[PDB]
Amino acid sequence: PVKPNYALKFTLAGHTKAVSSVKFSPNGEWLASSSADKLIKIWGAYDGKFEKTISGHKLGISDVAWSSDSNLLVSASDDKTLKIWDVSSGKCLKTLKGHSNYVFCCNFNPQSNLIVSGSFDESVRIWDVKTGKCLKTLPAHSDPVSAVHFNRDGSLIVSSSYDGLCRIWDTASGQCLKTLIDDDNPPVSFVKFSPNGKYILAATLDNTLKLWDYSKGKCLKTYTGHKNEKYCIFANFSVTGGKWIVSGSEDNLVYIWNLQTKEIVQKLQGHTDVVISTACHPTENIIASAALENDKTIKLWKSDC
């Protein structure tokens, strides 16, 4: 297809403060959301039906992530901890203590025996899921860490920071393998590996998304047209149908680009505040979007391609 046709299917209301992150479970059945209201909520991925609320953090939550078997969640909070949750029982299995300030981002590795986290304290930490202990503390950046993500086989971690850098780390050794810098270094607000593992996608607070060949250290694609000068907005690869780049925006729209041509192919209208988070369903052409304090809702969109 040349262009997708995402249309609003469901609006999910429940959070009483800004939503911070939405993520689809790997098995495609659920959507998890985190919020400044200190809560995690679980929703049906296909019907938007509210399932349950998971509570325990003492301050707002910035991020949530699923284990590969869709049974566990990890959350990152302003209370300087991460928590590991058994979704079915709602129980907090482990509280990960070590960061000295706000935890902003988190992710399981594919094996899901490890968690990576990034914090306002400018460090990246690697945790053992089963013991809950910190295995490594990486002196990753000189400003708050905005995102952390494992590659397809968990051998690498990419981190981004307001210091303008993206860095690639060897999971096993903790060594910094790459530092990525273009002709300028505006604050990097988000980063993640592509599904095929060949690229990273980085958002900078100069209204720009960039596709990098991280190995060769070269910028391949640039995506613009949206607004992003303040917030750490999640961006995504959509690969279930047409090959798109998906991101939120500070003009309250969801932006969708053709990955190859860099052309904007759709702008999704509906939210009434900054779209801070987007997520792409693992098998269906479905997008979840979430907005900040003046909106508080999550929206589910579906396309035929």
Ligand SMILES: CCCSc1nnc(C)c(O)n1
């Ligand atoms: C009873 C059907 C619930 S709705 C639904 N829609 N799409 C998919 C892929 C799915 O598994 N269920």
Ligand SMILES: CCCSc1nnc(C)c(O)n1
């Ligand atoms: C698992 C492969 C899904 S297909 C795919 N298509 N395009 C890109 C950029 C990508 O990373 N994966």
